[PDB]
Amino acid sequence: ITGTSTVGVGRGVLGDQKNINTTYSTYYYLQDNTRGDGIFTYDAKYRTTLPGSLWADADNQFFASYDAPAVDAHYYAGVTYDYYKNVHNRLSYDGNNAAIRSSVHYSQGYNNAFWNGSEMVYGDGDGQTFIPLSGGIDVVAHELTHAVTDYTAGLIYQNESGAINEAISDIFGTLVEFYANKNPDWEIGEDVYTPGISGDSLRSMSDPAKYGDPDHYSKRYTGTQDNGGVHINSGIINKAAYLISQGGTHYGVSVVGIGRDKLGKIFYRALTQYLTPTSNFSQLRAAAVQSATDLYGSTSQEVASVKQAFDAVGVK
Ligand SMILES: [Ca+2]
Ligand SMILES: [Ca+2]
Ligand SMILES: [Ca+2]
Ligand SMILES: [Ca+2]
Ligand SMILES: [Zn+2]
């Protein structure tokens, strides 16, 4: 829409107040003209037709309960844009400031959120398993990182390459949550999963086995469910990434942690310069080792820690 850039106020899914970038033209729309070619948020009105209608509001105040998922989808897409621009010098998911579009209120009682290849889509949850999925900053950044992968390595969504694709989204989802410093941790989806149970989450990067996902290559799922285990076998790479950042001893192998910032630089370089669509876990190890070599030197502690971490999870 063509109009005047302004700032409105509202409340997200968890009840927190935040300011949001909007555009005025008769109505106030959820259109942020300050980031690249724009961030646009649409109402899918409980239907599955996409994208729906650009979100319009009469007074620039978004405190209705129906508004909450749109407030957080719009705001957290801006935070994710800021992380990639400020930390990695990348302008939007294509690297050319492509517009970011998201639709909320998709379907009825839909327990998921996803990047569909053109835009973000978020369900409201059934209220038991999930609350509106855009309330989780790690979920929003996990899904927008799929758009980055699509335009760079292009990892296919099955078998080991799909598991790498999922782990890259959990790694950067987590790094965005730390960047925003929104109560950060190494768990995924704990702000929106099971409102009635405290302390759990969908997945854990520090201890994948807590929820039954593999934390070693010898325990990898080999069947056909979940596209060859893309959400299950990502645990092996997620544990490696946690060890590289934080350190620890895992199955008797000790790793010295190098911190989150270097973890992010190593994996972003691996994703944008060395991974290909059909890379497997072994090729990811090679890409991460080469990336660390490029940035820190072949005889650095950083290269040593990457090698030890893949050794700890049995990936050679
Ligand atoms: Ca209003
Ligand atoms: Ca958290
Ligand atoms: Ca988290
Ligand atoms: Ca919970
Ligand atoms: Zn994913």
Side-chain angles (χ1 to χ4, degrees):
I1 251 140
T2 300
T4 295
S5 298
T6 191
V7 177
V9 59
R11 202 176 289 154
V13 172
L14 295 183
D16 56 323
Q17 186 164 298
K18 57 244 285 177
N19 289 320
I20 39 178
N21 295 109
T22 58
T23 294
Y24 171 73
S25 194
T26 302
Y27 282 93
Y28 294 88
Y29 291 91
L30 292 182
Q31 174 181 136
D32 177 1
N33 312 125
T34 72
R35 293 177 166 95
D37 294 333
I39 292 173
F40 297 84
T41 302
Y42 293 80
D43 187 1
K45 306 182 193 180
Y46 305 135
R47 297 217 68 99
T48 48
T49 50
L50 293 172
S53 303
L54 184 65
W55 194 286
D57 184 86
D59 65 7
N60 213 21
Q61 293 193 112
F62 298 83
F63 296 101
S65 63
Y66 193 78
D67 299 337
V71 170
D72 279 343
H74 196 66
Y75 185 91
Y76 294 140
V79 176
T80 304
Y81 175 98
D82 294 356
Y83 167 79
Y84 277 103
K85 174 183 181 188
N86 294 315
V87 180
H88 299 292
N89 261 79
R90 188 187 187 78
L91 299 173
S92 196
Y93 56 82
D94 65 344
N96 204 23
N97 268 158
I100 292 167
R101 291 182 201 280
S102 302
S103 297
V104 296
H105 297 307
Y106 173 77
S107 197
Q108 300 187 17
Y110 185 72
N111 292 319
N112 208 356
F114 54 96
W115 167 257
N116 82 340
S118 302
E119 58 163 289
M120 280 295 319
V121 184
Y122 294 97
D124 286 323
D126 60 17
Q128 261 233 332
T129 307
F130 280 100
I131 57 182
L133 282 88
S134 56
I137 188 177
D138 56 0
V139 169
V140 168
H142 171 112
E143 290 303 330
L144 283 167
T145 295
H146 283 305
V148 177
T149 298
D150 276 5
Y151 276 84
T152 54
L155 289 159
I156 62 173
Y157 204 65
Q158 72 180 313
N159 291 340
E160 285 186 17
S161 60
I164 296 165
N165 193 325
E166 282 300 312
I168 295 283
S169 277
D170 284 344
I171 291 166
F172 285 104
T174 290
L175 300 174
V176 174
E177 180 172 312
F178 275 93
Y179 171 79
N181 190 49
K182 256 223 77 199
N183 283 286
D185 50 54
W186 290 91
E187 299 282 298
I188 301 294
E190 76 285 338
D191 298 333
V192 293
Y193 184 55
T194 49
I197 295 168
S198 283
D200 62 357
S201 66
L202 218 48
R203 287 186 285 288
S204 179
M205 303 177 67
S206 61
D207 178 23
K210 179 189 296 165
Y211 301 118
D213 293 322
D215 57 1
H216 194 278
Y217 196 67
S218 63
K219 307 191 180 192
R220 71 195 188 278
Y221 174 71
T222 54
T224 40
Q225 289 284 205
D226 183 41
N227 285 114
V230 306
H231 298 95
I232 298 166
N233 287 332
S234 55
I236 295 164
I237 303 306
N238 284 343
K239 178 83 181 189
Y242 173 81
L243 290 171
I244 289 171
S245 184
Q246 303 306 106
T249 292
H250 182 58
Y251 291 102
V253 177
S254 294
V255 187
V256 181
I258 59 175
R260 294 187 308 275
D261 294 345
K262 297 171 171 182
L263 170 69
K265 288 175 186 274
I266 293 166
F267 270 81
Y268 180 81
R269 185 162 179 95
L271 177 71
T272 59
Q273 302 281 1
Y274 301 118
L275 295 171
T276 65
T278 60
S279 293
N280 59 25
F281 283 8
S282 187
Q283 298 167 308
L284 171 67
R285 168 181 177 137
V289 173
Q290 178 63 230
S291 296
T293 296
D294 294 349
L295 291 165
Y296 307 108
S298 62
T299 70
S300 63
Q301 176 61 250
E302 293 85 351
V303 169
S305 290
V306 176
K307 293 182 168 164
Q308 285 287 296
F310 281 98
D311 283 348
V313 302
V315 172
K316 280 81 199 198

